[PDB]
Amino acid sequence: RVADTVGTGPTNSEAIPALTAAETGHTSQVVPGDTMQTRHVKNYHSRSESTIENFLCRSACVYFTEYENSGAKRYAEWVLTPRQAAQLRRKLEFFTYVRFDLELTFVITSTQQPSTTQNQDAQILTHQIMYVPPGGPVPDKVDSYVWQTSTNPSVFWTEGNAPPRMSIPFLSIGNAYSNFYDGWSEFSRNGVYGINTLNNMGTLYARHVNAGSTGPIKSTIRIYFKPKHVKAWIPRPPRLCQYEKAKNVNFQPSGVTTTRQSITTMT
Amino acid sequence: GYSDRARSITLGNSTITTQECANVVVGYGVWPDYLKDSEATAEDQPTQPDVATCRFYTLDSVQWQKTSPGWWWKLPDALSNLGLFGQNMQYHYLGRTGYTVHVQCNASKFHQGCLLVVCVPEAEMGCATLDNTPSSAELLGGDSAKEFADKPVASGSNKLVQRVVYNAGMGVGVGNLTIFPHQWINLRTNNSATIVMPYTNSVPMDNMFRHNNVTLMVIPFVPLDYCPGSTTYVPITVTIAPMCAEYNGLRLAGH
Amino acid sequence: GYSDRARSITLGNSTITTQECANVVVGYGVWPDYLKDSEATAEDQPTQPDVATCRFYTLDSVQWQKTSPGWWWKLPDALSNLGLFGQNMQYHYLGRTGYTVHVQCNASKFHQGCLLVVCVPEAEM
Amino acid sequence: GAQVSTQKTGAHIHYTNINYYKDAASNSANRQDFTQDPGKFTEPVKDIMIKSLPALN
Amino acid sequence: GAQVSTQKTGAHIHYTNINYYKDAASNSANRQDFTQDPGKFTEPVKDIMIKSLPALN
Amino acid sequence: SITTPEEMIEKAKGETAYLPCKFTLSPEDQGPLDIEWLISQVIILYSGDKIYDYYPDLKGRVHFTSLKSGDASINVTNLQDIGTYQCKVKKAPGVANKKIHLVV
Amino acid sequence: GLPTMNTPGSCQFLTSDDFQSPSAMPQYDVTPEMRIPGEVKNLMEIAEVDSVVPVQNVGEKVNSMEAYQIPVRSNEGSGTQVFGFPLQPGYSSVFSRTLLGEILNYYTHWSGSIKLTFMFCGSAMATGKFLLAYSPPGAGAPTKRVDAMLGTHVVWDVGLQSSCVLCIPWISQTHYRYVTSDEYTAGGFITCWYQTNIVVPADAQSSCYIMCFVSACNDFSVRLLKDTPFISQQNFF
Amino acid sequence: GLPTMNTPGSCQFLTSDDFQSPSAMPQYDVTPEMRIPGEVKNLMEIAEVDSVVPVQNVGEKVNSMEAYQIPVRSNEGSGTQVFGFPLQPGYSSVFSRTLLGEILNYYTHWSGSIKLTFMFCGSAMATGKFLLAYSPPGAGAPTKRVDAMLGTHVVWDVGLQSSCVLCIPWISQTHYRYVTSDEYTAGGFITCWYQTNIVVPADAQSSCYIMCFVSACNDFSVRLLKDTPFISQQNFF
Ligand SMILES: CCCCCCCCCCCCCCCC(=O)O
């Protein structure tokens, strides 16, 4: 809960709360009652919605891809990374190190594609989503023996019910996820520079278990991240320049802010 | 009865004394200490010289002109070739340490200028090209100044780093760089700036040669000015002192 | 119940183990220790790495032929270019230290030979 | 074994909760954690600076 | 008749469970059973061998 | 991740042109390796652990410098050959590519 | 078979709901936390820090470090205006890019006081006095030092302590204000005039600069989480 | 009719969930357990056992029993290298097929110490000394006995006790390492040189062999269950 304003009166003394030195970091801890007369005002406003948990714990789309039920592109793949989008990435890049559990949600929708086949009476489509850990076998095709999912975690979904949701524990060899890394993976200091070196989140595969019809159908999957049980350290300034790539912080220099007409202009 | 403007710091066989200063900033409220037994992961015993490393090393000075954008230094890379601190980190695989940054800039009452001294952890910097990444020996400098540049660096097929002062090479507002521990040198009042930084990382120990924990930045928000007659050459000097440094994984020398 | 012929020595990150040995000679009855406060003369504080120097350094081997007279080594000069021991002594003006000398020569039952291993202080030549 | 806590209400009610999994990373988020300490970012100096006294004397 | 047990958390919470069938082969798996005894595979000898002493004297 | 994806190499005529495409395989990436060199349409192809020698002008001129280790560079010769070469390395989970501009 | 009944709102996905879900990696041992310095527990600890304000964001100054500087000088007059800008912490071009302003862009309502610190960056021989004033909405921007004095003001005298703090208080009819530009919940105006004149001796520079830092008081609050209008993604990077 | 509401994640199948299900054979009497010897309660009891390591997996040796043997002999020199290989327990060709290595191939993270036992398999008249060394990552493989000594080493003297144990400790910046080949979490190098020279009398063989066994210490751990890359099924057998 926020502090309540107190009441002061007229004052003539040697005390100087206003006058200070900004050379020192010391952010002046002055309150309005030091430079004017104030009345007592109880403040029932509460600092609740501003906590890091309420700030970060909301679902946010990070990647959407397609696949088919016929032809060449029969399954989809995506290395797990939150830097694909801009809204989730900017919010996470307020801090240097974050540590949070992840809640995963998927939204899978199909669409009948234009063709010329006749008598298309489709059946219900079932989709399988499979995760491969950094080092696990990856499916060469859509009928590979990899989908046996003996140990890899997988999920099956029949089109028409509530979306599939699963919860993932903090997965890292370190003690906190690192949003920014200044360094290289190789000691010789000649290779990949940046966070890319640290990232190792595995790959995600999605596909149609059955065809379901004679005509073409294209399915699309959207992935939603929700950080739970969040901890965060060492805050840093928000991104001014627009993002360019997903692996690095490459940017184009831009204006510090927008411009007005004069220095005394109110608009 | 003394004056709070006077301060002395003694580390190892070295001392610094200030006649005019602001205060000491102590990082995130943490004074640097050693690694506990419940936070460690390496089994073999650490070495702790305690005196031959934790002293003051004085880097090369830099001239502050009327049109200087600013300078940056990597604290692990800067003390790589200096004293026994460099030799210990060379032989060992894992190094953990904290630092302090005393920046000295002295001018007369007539001279007017403003300097911002800030330490940035994980200060990853971007390349001029959007496709490639900054090359080493272009971002890093051994005991070198590594100044910034007003206006954008040209875009081409070259691992050059973007040195814009207003974006600071990280793509963030130069003004908002006050979120990290910062101290201001105002020629009319403050002469030097002292900052103490505790070890900050997502792991207990890290390889000093391939990773840089912090980046010291000195940026003149208000330019240097004077009248014909006063001294033109006005230098800035930096001294760094590793605190509570310990090393692990002794092996053959090199990197 | 073990055999006195077996010995192990652990210093720093190094170890040596012997299957056949005689014993350990301990100098003049003194085990090496640090400098006391009533025997010191220098004022400034000493450095003590304690692990990066006090370990085992292995010098180059020498062939024992049928007509070899003998060999000699200066212990301070020998470890001058080896590891962090050499680097610490280079930067510093004053150094105080003790040592141990494990000499290894293994031959079969048929081979017959005798070697004398002695440490000479102030061995001016 | 249920936990009863307070609901978020205005100023100027209790709710019940049970954990159905055995993983501790399956529970709901921790929304009611109201603890602050800005003495790290603001006022990060060594010698304490009183408000009324001068900064540099 | 419910059983309350501990959740799997990190180091440096309770959960509730009730059995709804009468078959004992319908319950959930037993994931929290942390008991080891490698003295069978490792050290499978008759005469105990101390570490410091020699193996064959 | 292929280092320096955007690069320009100026080489004099009568001197073998050296093109380097060094890469670092991701831990996530564990699939069959394919290395393809494009000239902007192929000069050389490495696939299923086999090298195939595609371009009539550069036939008998393009050969690899080292592939399994992580180096997939080529050494061209008898320059006359001005064009853009795109080195595309493929792993089943992830893919990367580097474009080099050669003048004269 | 316990008889139940499904209410409206079943099998739906809410971007902001709080439910339990079966873990996909059972009995996973997380790494033991270490103490990393500087933990954030609330966003109102990032906002209570000072941030240089680009007041001179005129023309091409935004592409230079000149935007932060406020130019003051010696003139043959008095009562001239130094600067002025409205009190719109989230929307005004002057504050949109500062730490507190960027935090506000993720919220709809804001309510509290605002600290404005000014540091003199001239010679140690130059001296002067300034009048820092805040005017509540109702009548337009004050056009003279005399109209400005009738509002909340602080007379700043430059000496040993270079900095000064004008604390803009909460004067509003409502309990909260709108971060977006609105006319019902208007802010006010903040202006700066010359209380006296800049006094400079010989062989010293008569053209100085001031710098401005903005922060929040201990009674600041925000509400209604929303999406910042600043970031824009053309396609998946 | 109790009013309920279905949350997202209903009617889905999870390869790794923990629910109850109605038995298809009600009131079934299982056979009474008998005590069979040698019960496994954890997979880290299968890993703490020694397993011969194929160090000489060169050329066609993999199709022979020769792969396990390390050839040592009498040479007119000293300080020559016997063998060397990196510390990658799950990925290195040297350890991929051992019990501990095969167990690691079902996990993503591994963290602990590693025991390496060496048994001399020469005559009872042959004698010698060996230097077993482990070098932490940062500078490449040591190319000389002198560079190897600067790292963790053990001087092994062959006598009555033929075996020797070099215990590779946990020196890492992180808490866990990656089973898959990675450059951030690199292991180190393990080499073996001649501390002296092999001494052999007459009418005895001067060409001997060593054997190497690998196991885990009492502080080994693994995480993230995954699928081994070794097995491959063309079709249902
Ligand atoms: C069908 C099962 C699917 C399971 C997929 C689990 C994937 C987990 C990915 C976690 C990514 C977390 C990245 C955080 C990076 C950061 O915070 O900087």
GROMACS .gro file of C-alpha atoms in nm, chain B residues 1-245:
model
  245
  268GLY     CA    1   3.582   1.775   1.284
  269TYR     CA    2   3.664   1.696   0.919
  270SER     CA    3   3.505   1.755   0.572
  271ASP     CA    4   3.305   1.477   0.394
  272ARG     CA    5   3.470   1.600   0.066
  273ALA     CA    6   3.798   1.427   0.167
  274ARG     CA    7   3.837   1.047   0.121
  275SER     CA    8   4.121   0.789   0.125
  276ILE     CA    9   4.120   0.433  -0.008
  277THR     CA   10   4.392   0.179   0.078
  278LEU     CA   11   4.419  -0.152  -0.107
  279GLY     CA   12   4.728  -0.368  -0.111
  280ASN     CA   13   5.037  -0.152  -0.137
  281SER     CA   14   4.841   0.129  -0.301
  282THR     CA   15   4.646   0.433  -0.184
  283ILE     CA   16   4.436   0.706  -0.340
  284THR     CA   17   4.342   1.035  -0.168
  285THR     CA   18   4.085   1.294  -0.291
  286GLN     CA   19   4.057   1.664  -0.189
  287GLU     CA   20   3.717   1.712  -0.361
  288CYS     CA   21   3.475   1.417  -0.418
  289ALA     CA   22   3.100   1.343  -0.402
  290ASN     CA   23   3.060   1.010  -0.221
  291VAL     CA   24   3.109   0.636  -0.279
  292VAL     CA   25   2.846   0.433  -0.462
  293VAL     CA   26   2.837   0.074  -0.342
  294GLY     CA   27   2.679  -0.106  -0.633
  295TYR     CA   28   2.346  -0.268  -0.548
  296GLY     CA   29   2.394  -0.225  -0.175
  297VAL     CA   30   2.630  -0.523  -0.171
  298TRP     CA   31   2.992  -0.513  -0.062
  299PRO     CA   32   3.200  -0.771  -0.252
  300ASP     CA   33   3.286  -1.085  -0.055
  301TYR     CA   34   3.410  -1.438  -0.119
  302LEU     CA   35   3.216  -1.741  -0.239
  303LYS     CA   36   3.031  -1.932   0.032
  304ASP     CA   37   3.031  -2.309   0.071
  305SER     CA   38   2.660  -2.340  -0.008
  306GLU     CA   39   2.684  -2.145  -0.335
  307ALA     CA   40   2.995  -2.306  -0.484
  308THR     CA   41   3.004  -2.581  -0.744
  309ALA     CA   42   3.370  -2.652  -0.818
  310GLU     CA   43   3.531  -2.909  -0.592
  311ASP     CA   44   3.901  -2.827  -0.603
  312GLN     CA   45   4.039  -2.564  -0.369
  313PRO     CA   46   4.058  -2.200  -0.483
  314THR     CA   47   4.366  -1.982  -0.477
  315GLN     CA   48   4.338  -1.635  -0.319
  316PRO     CA   49   4.650  -1.411  -0.358
  317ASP     CA   50   4.466  -1.139  -0.150
  318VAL     CA   51   4.735  -0.866  -0.199
  319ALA     CA   52   4.914  -0.921  -0.529
  320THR     CA   53   4.593  -0.877  -0.729
  321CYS     CA   54   4.363  -0.666  -0.510
  322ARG     CA   55   4.543  -0.335  -0.558
  323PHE     CA   56   4.507  -0.033  -0.786
  324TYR     CA   57   4.600  -0.057  -1.155
  325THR     CA   58   4.614   0.269  -1.349
  326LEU     CA   59   4.509   0.253  -1.718
  327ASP     CA   60   4.625   0.496  -1.995
  328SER     CA   61   4.478   0.852  -1.980
  329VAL     CA   62   4.252   1.005  -2.248
  330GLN     CA   63   4.230   1.366  -2.362
  331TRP     CA   64   3.890   1.529  -2.317
  332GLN     CA   65   3.847   1.766  -2.608
  333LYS     CA   66   3.561   1.998  -2.693
  334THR     CA   67   3.414   1.739  -2.934
  335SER     CA   68   3.471   1.402  -2.765
  336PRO     CA   69   3.173   1.162  -2.774
  337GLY     CA   70   3.281   0.925  -2.499
  338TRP     CA   71   3.484   0.619  -2.407
  339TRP     CA   72   3.420   0.259  -2.293
  340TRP     CA   73   3.641  -0.015  -2.136
  341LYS     CA   74   3.581  -0.388  -2.061
  342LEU     CA   75   3.694  -0.439  -1.696
  343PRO     CA   76   3.800  -0.811  -1.736
  344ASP     CA   77   3.973  -0.739  -2.073
  345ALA     CA   78   4.142  -0.417  -1.948
  346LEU     CA   79   4.343  -0.582  -1.662
  347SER     CA   80   4.431  -0.890  -1.878
  348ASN     CA   81   4.792  -0.773  -1.946
  349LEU     CA   82   4.848  -0.580  -1.616
  350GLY     CA   83   5.051  -0.713  -1.316
  351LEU     CA   84   4.988  -1.054  -1.149
  352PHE     CA   85   4.609  -1.015  -1.202
  353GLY     CA   86   4.664  -1.095  -1.573
  354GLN     CA   87   4.904  -1.386  -1.501
  355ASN     CA   88   4.666  -1.558  -1.251
  356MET     CA   89   4.365  -1.539  -1.491
  357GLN     CA   90   4.585  -1.671  -1.778
  358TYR     CA   91   4.687  -2.002  -1.608
  359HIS     CA   92   4.344  -2.063  -1.440
  360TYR     CA   93   4.015  -2.178  -1.607
  361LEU     CA   94   3.764  -2.015  -1.362
  362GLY     CA   95   3.791  -1.663  -1.210
  363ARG     CA   96   3.548  -1.477  -0.977
  364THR     CA   97   3.609  -1.110  -0.877
  365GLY     CA   98   3.462  -0.765  -0.790
  366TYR     CA   99   3.594  -0.417  -0.877
  367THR     CA  100   3.597  -0.043  -0.795
  368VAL     CA  101   3.635   0.239  -1.057
  369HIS     CA  102   3.802   0.565  -0.943
  370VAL     CA  103   3.785   0.812  -1.240
  371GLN     CA  104   3.991   1.134  -1.192
  372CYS     CA  105   3.937   1.456  -1.397
  373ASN     CA  106   4.066   1.786  -1.245
  374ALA     CA  107   3.997   2.133  -1.396
  375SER     CA  108   4.005   2.499  -1.273
  376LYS     CA  109   3.703   2.711  -1.163
  377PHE     CA  110   3.688   2.879  -1.511
  378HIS     CA  111   3.663   2.538  -1.693
  379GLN     CA  112   3.303   2.398  -1.716
  380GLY     CA  113   3.211   2.036  -1.811
  381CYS     CA  114   2.995   1.733  -1.713
  382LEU     CA  115   3.090   1.358  -1.728
  383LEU     CA  116   2.867   1.052  -1.659
  384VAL     CA  117   3.048   0.744  -1.511
  385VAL     CA  118   2.831   0.425  -1.526
  386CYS     CA  119   2.909   0.047  -1.504
  387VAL     CA  120   2.694  -0.174  -1.736
  388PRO     CA  121   2.670  -0.552  -1.666
  389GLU     CA  122   2.631  -0.768  -1.984
  390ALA     CA  123   2.672  -0.452  -2.199
  391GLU     CA  124   2.628  -0.651  -2.526
  392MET     CA  125   2.700  -0.413  -2.820
  393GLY     CA  126   2.561  -0.422  -3.177
  394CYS     CA  127   2.737  -0.427  -3.520
  395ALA     CA  128   2.699  -0.163  -3.798
  396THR     CA  129   2.576  -0.442  -4.031
  397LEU     CA  130   2.234  -0.591  -3.933
  398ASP     CA  131   2.334  -0.940  -4.061
  399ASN     CA  132   2.682  -0.998  -3.906
  400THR     CA  133   2.807  -0.949  -3.544
  401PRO     CA  134   3.081  -0.719  -3.399
  402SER     CA  135   3.434  -0.865  -3.441
  403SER     CA  136   3.673  -0.890  -3.145
  404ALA     CA  137   3.968  -0.642  -3.140
  405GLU     CA  138   3.704  -0.398  -3.278
  406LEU     CA  139   3.479  -0.399  -2.967
  407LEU     CA  140   3.765  -0.485  -2.724
  408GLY     CA  141   4.081  -0.275  -2.657
  409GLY     CA  142   4.386  -0.370  -2.446
  410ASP     CA  143   4.458  -0.080  -2.205
  411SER     CA  144   4.299   0.117  -2.498
  412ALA     CA  145   4.052   0.413  -2.493
  413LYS     CA  146   3.786   0.275  -2.741
  414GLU     CA  147   3.594   0.606  -2.796
  415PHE     CA  148   3.235   0.642  -2.938
  416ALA     CA  149   3.123   0.847  -3.244
  417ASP     CA  150   2.843   1.105  -3.297
  418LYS     CA  151   2.633   1.006  -3.606
  419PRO     CA  152   2.576   0.643  -3.738
  420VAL     CA  153   2.861   0.415  -3.861
  421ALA     CA  154   2.829   0.333  -4.236
  422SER     CA  155   2.650   0.004  -4.323
  423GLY     CA  156   2.853  -0.242  -4.539
  424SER     CA  157   3.006  -0.595  -4.535
  425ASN     CA  158   3.236  -0.521  -4.231
  426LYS     CA  159   3.228  -0.649  -3.865
  427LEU     CA  160   3.251  -0.280  -3.746
  428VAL     CA  161   3.060  -0.199  -3.422
  429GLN     CA  162   2.788   0.074  -3.418
  430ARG     CA  163   2.949   0.346  -3.198
  431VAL     CA  164   2.658   0.600  -3.183
  432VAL     CA  165   2.685   0.788  -2.848
  433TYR     CA  166   2.307   0.864  -2.828
  434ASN     CA  167   2.218   0.490  -2.861
  435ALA     CA  168   2.546   0.393  -2.678
  436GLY     CA  169   2.600   0.081  -2.901
  437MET     CA  170   2.324  -0.115  -2.715
  438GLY     CA  171   2.019   0.047  -2.884
  439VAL     CA  172   1.893   0.211  -2.558
  440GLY     CA  173   1.850   0.580  -2.460
  441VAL     CA  174   2.182   0.730  -2.334
  442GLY     CA  175   1.990   0.929  -2.065
  443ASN     CA  176   1.820   0.618  -1.912
  444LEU     CA  177   2.169   0.465  -1.845
  445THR     CA  178   2.123   0.591  -1.484
  446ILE     CA  179   1.950   0.259  -1.388
  447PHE     CA  180   2.295   0.098  -1.327
  448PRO     CA  181   2.521   0.241  -1.043
  449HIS     CA  182   2.624   0.585  -1.182
  450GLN     CA  183   2.824   0.888  -1.051
  451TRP     CA  184   2.845   1.238  -1.212
  452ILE     CA  185   3.168   1.443  -1.237
  453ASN     CA  186   3.080   1.818  -1.240
  454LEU     CA  187   3.401   2.024  -1.295
  455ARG     CA  188   3.249   2.312  -1.089
  456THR     CA  189   3.215   2.077  -0.784
  457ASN     CA  190   3.303   1.702  -0.819
  458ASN     CA  191   3.664   1.623  -0.928
  459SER     CA  192   3.655   1.239  -0.914
  460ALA     CA  193   3.395   0.955  -0.907
  461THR     CA  194   3.421   0.628  -0.702
  462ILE     CA  195   3.201   0.320  -0.778
  463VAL     CA  196   3.225  -0.021  -0.598
  464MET     CA  197   3.076  -0.317  -0.794
  465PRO     CA  198   3.010  -0.667  -0.642
  466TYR     CA  199   3.051  -0.975  -0.869
  467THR     CA  200   2.728  -1.006  -1.075
  468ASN     CA  201   2.663  -1.319  -1.291
  469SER     CA  202   2.402  -1.598  -1.346
  470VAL     CA  203   2.669  -1.859  -1.249
  471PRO     CA  204   2.914  -1.881  -0.949
  472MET     CA  205   3.238  -1.853  -1.158
  473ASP     CA  206   3.305  -1.774  -1.529
  474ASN     CA  207   3.594  -1.788  -1.781
  475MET     CA  208   3.743  -1.432  -1.773
  476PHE     CA  209   3.898  -1.458  -2.126
  477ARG     CA  210   3.575  -1.537  -2.322
  478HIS     CA  211   3.324  -1.337  -2.107
  479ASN     CA  212   3.315  -0.975  -1.977
  480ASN     CA  213   3.108  -0.915  -1.656
  481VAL     CA  214   3.092  -0.530  -1.676
  482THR     CA  215   3.170  -0.232  -1.915
  483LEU     CA  216   3.282   0.106  -1.779
  484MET     CA  217   3.148   0.404  -1.972
  485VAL     CA  218   3.247   0.772  -1.953
  486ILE     CA  219   3.019   1.003  -2.151
  487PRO     CA  220   3.036   1.386  -2.156
  488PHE     CA  221   2.673   1.499  -2.142
  489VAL     CA  222   2.783   1.866  -2.133
  490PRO     CA  223   3.089   1.958  -2.342
  491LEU     CA  224   3.417   2.101  -2.222
  492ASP     CA  225   3.447   2.480  -2.246
  493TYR     CA  226   3.696   2.758  -2.146
  494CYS     CA  227   3.822   3.099  -2.268
  495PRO     CA  228   4.140   3.172  -2.473
  496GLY     CA  229   4.435   3.145  -2.231
  497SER     CA  230   4.324   2.861  -1.999
  498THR     CA  231   4.479   2.514  -2.035
  499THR     CA  232   4.346   2.313  -2.332
  500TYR     CA  233   4.485   1.965  -2.257
  501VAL     CA  234   4.248   1.816  -1.999
  502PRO     CA  235   4.297   1.442  -1.936
  503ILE     CA  236   4.084   1.174  -1.773
  504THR     CA  237   4.250   0.887  -1.584
  505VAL     CA  238   4.100   0.557  -1.466
  506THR     CA  239   4.218   0.325  -1.188
  507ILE     CA  240   4.058  -0.019  -1.129
  508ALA     CA  241   4.110  -0.240  -0.818
  509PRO     CA  242   3.993  -0.608  -0.816
  510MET     CA  243   3.829  -0.696  -0.479
  511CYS     CA  244   3.787  -1.045  -0.320
  512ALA     CA  245   3.926  -1.220  -0.630
   0.00000   0.00000   0.00000
